[PDB]
Predict the structure.
Amino acid sequence: MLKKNDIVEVEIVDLTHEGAGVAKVDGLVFFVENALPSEKILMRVLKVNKKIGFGKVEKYLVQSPHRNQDLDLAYLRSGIADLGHLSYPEQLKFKTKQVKDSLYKIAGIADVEVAETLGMEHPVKYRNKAQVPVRRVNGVLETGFFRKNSHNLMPLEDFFIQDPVIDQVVVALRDLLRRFDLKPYDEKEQSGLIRNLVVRRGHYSGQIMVVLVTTRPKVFRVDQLIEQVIKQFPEIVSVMQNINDQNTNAIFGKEWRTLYGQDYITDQMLGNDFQIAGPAFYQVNTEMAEKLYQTAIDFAELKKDDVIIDAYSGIGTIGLSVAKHVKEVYGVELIPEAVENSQKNASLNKITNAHYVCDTAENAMKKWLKEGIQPTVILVDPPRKGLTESFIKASAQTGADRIAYISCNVATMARDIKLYQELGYELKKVQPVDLFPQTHHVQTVALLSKLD
RNA sequence: AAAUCCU
Ligand SMILES: Nc1ncnc2c1ncn2[C@@H]1O[C@H](CSCC[C@H](N)C(=O)O)[C@@H](O)[C@H]1O
């Protein structure tokens, strides 16, 4: 019978989907941070529960051959790069395995093709967006990242997985906030002004948005602070402000203001251009998203007489990438600022067959089913939570030949696939694509197809 | 349960 602060020798024999090592000691399953399969360790017992436990590595007796000894990545492991300690080919194997394991555990599929995960040539310096808290650490305003399961800011200049320019811009903005004596936010004391900095930068265009996320509308000498950052970085076309007065883990509140220039950046994906608002979603890994889409598009086998639904449209990138190669494109997007981009993105690219509606995807499908639209293909790309039961049920009743499901969470996709199978759709292909190198997150594309 | 970390 184990208990807190005991040290025991264990072999790690698996990984959780989130990246934590698994060892099984005396009826307990232990989740050990920074422990890879086959590693011998002395495990410190942190917490004992009924069926599970939690552990810390006290000593490595034997490490993995697949361990990455990079000391620079180890600082990030407890946070933004939670799989950095595993070598890249094995990360890919791990992610492929996770997709297979989820389709079985959740949906009872063992017989379907799951191609190996498509990885990056150079899996670094990829993210086009960065969200960076601003905090006081030892009486000094610092940008960085939060330690896992915490709000303790780890000071950091080199983010490893982000666009190097974004790191330069965030370091510049940190130094400017220090010089202008603008107070960082304190969560516990509920005092200060500057909560987070959000910096999006177009993968091809290089055009930069800077969102200053603050506790109150009034920012003291912000016009001068912008004036200086534009001289360092001429590529800033937009400086936005966001007010968030709540005590919440959520980044933005309701109010968005434009402090300078445009209220959008412009970037390329596949052939076309796309305007992108601050509150709108843009795929963080443009390089691999283009691949993610090109897989989905090839899976969909598009004819000129097809009628596509692009559910969870965003700024319209999937729908508009295919609109010139088909009859009609209908899309739905809940966030007004994104679906307004989507409308302009259609006009920019000369696409007059791209019709959009601002609503929940659940509701848009219900109206489109009543209104008598005849969709042949359905592309879906929901957030982690996945799809609603009512959306799956409605989409089945449209009699759509193919459904292509893009996902950033295989757990919810496996569930939702399970329900598509109960309504006469069959899972044909699956291709995982590594949008998030050095992290536990798997992106996926699954082709469902109907039976007569 | 909103988003790479952001209980
Ligand atoms: N119930 C709902 N109905 C429609 N859209 C929703 C929704 N819940 C969240 N969303 C939206 O779904 C989108 C998911 S991500 C959008 C992906 C887009 N195709 C792109 O690659 O750019 C977000 O834009 C989000 O605002």
Residues 127-282 of chain A form one domain. Chain A has three domains: 1-79, 80-126+283-452, 127-282.
